[PDB]
Ligand binder design. Sequence first.
Ligand SMILES: Nc1ncnc2c1ncn2[C@@H]1O[C@H](COP(=O)(O)OP(=O)(O)O)[C@@H](O)[C@H]1O
Ligand SMILES: [Cl-]
Ligand SMILES: [Mg+2]
Ligand SMILES: [Mg+2]
Lengths: 6, 361, 19
Amino acid sequence: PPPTPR
Amino acid sequence: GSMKVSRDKDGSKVTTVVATPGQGPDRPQEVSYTDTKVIGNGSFGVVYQAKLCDSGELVAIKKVLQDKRFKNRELQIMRKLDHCNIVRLRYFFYSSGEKKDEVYLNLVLDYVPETVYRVARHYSRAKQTLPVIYVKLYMYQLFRSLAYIHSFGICHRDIKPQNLLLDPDTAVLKLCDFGSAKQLVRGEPNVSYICSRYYRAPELIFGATDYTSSIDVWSAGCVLAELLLGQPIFPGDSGVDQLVEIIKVLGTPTREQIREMNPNYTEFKFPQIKAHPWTKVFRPRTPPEAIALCSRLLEYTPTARLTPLEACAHSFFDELRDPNVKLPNGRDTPALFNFTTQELSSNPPLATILIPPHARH
Amino acid sequence: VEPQKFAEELIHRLEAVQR
Ligand SMILES: Nc1ncnc2c1ncn2[C@@H]1O[C@H](COP(=O)(O)OP(=O)(O)O)[C@@H](O)[C@H]1O
Ligand SMILES: [Cl-]
Ligand SMILES: [Mg+2]
Ligand SMILES: [Mg+2]
């Protein structure tokens, strides 16, 4: 799972 | 980025780059390495092993693509870290790669040959259980690294066996992979879909955005349970699958516990499933104090979970504080009591327990 | 992810495993 989007 | 590629003294390909050291002010220096080979690969990028030409020491080079879509704090987080149970960032530099006219970030780290996952997998396919002494050693060092990063307000957000590097000879554990890590600030929301499957805290599965560093403690509890059990304790493809496994062990959370995790779920009528006793969860030969510790980590209410520093002081690790303990290979245990003021900042009086009298001399 | 839809699935699953 990826971190928060920009 | 400029990268001089040449050969030297044996036809061995030598790569020269100008790399910035991990610590201190930015003072980049020429770094030469050889014997480059891929030891890891994925959608994140590539991981190479290489040998520094000067010292001859082995290093890992994590080469990740500068993705403008998401936020990556991996570099900025690793640069401020310096602890014996966290993998060291020696240098970093920028270069090109597969994508045309694109820029990649290269992280030069200490090379550590094994992981907790690979070691655990050996015992699983051999139908053996990891000796309790190693469970103590690995878990203790994990909690120290957590106590360290939490003191800066940094949450790893991806604690799992694959991210725990091991040097089996010295039994030293090093936490790695800070691509999901973040400095948590109260009042500022965080992404909920974080942490790897099997190790995701219940509040994360419930979709909380106001979670704290205690999610790392839950994940650590999952690692502990896994080492004792020989397999993941809460497997499942989806969040619901994993939550069912958790409920089958802990029992249905109370309304108050649900509120502590995510208030938006307090008014639903979940069926009441009885808890399965921890002594029945693990094998009958499992040490009572390991069961006790695990039940204090795997708690629904995040504030009820032990802090990493408190976990180190738990009775399960009492053996490690014995003067006459040695590794099964014959060597002494790694450094375990060299706590700094920063590590103890969360709870200074714990030093009485954490530092045994035979360690103060 | 609606809390309603999520709880609905969870309740369904828990009823299946409930003694
Ligand atoms: N410093 C290292 N030395 C040796 N192996 C490493 C090192 N760092 C990472 N690895 C190995 O490469 C794998 C990927 O590293 P990691 O940082 O976790 O990448 P990712 O962010 O994609 O998960 C790890 O599972 C680990 O086994
Ligand atoms: Cl039940
Ligand atoms: Mg990883
Ligand atoms: Mg990562």
